[PDB]
Design a protein around this nucleic acid. Structure first.
Ligand SMILES: [Zn+2]
Ligand SMILES: [Zn+2]
Length: 96
DNA sequence: CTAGCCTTGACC
DNA sequence: GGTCAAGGCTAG
């Protein structure tokens, strides 16, 4: 589906385990790269959509985890390019 | 911090 | 050599 499972924005490709928008790709990568830790200021279940996703990073990252984005696809040694161990996992979603 | 566009590079 | 998901860069 053309819709980001985190926020509903236009999907730009497989990112970190599944189809996501460009923004949720960037956000997940920044968070995991730098071990960022956020605070929800309401009740830890804010609605995430294209126009609210900036408002609560905590609940945005919670939802990234929840829909299945993978911490392991973020690379510790920051190598660019090539293909990770999910390259073949992306094969069977392109069949489903 | 955000998010669009750019560059890399192992796999095929 | 081409693909396309990694990481990189930078206005705003
Ligand atoms: Zn998204
Ligand atoms: Zn929240």
């Amino acid at each position: 589906e053309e819709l980001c499972p985190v926020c509903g924005d236009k999907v730009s490709g497989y990112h970190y385990g599944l189809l996501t928008c460009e923004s949720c790709k960037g956000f997940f990568k920044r968070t995991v790269q730098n071990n960022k830790r956020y605070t929800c200021i309401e009740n830890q279940n804010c609605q995430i959509d294209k126009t609210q996703r900036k408002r609560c990073p905590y609940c945005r990252f919670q939802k990234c985890l929840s829909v299945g984005m993978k911490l392991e696809a973020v690379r510790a040694d920051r190598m660019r390019g090539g293909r990770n161990k999910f390259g073949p996992m992306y094969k069977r979603d392109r069949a489903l």
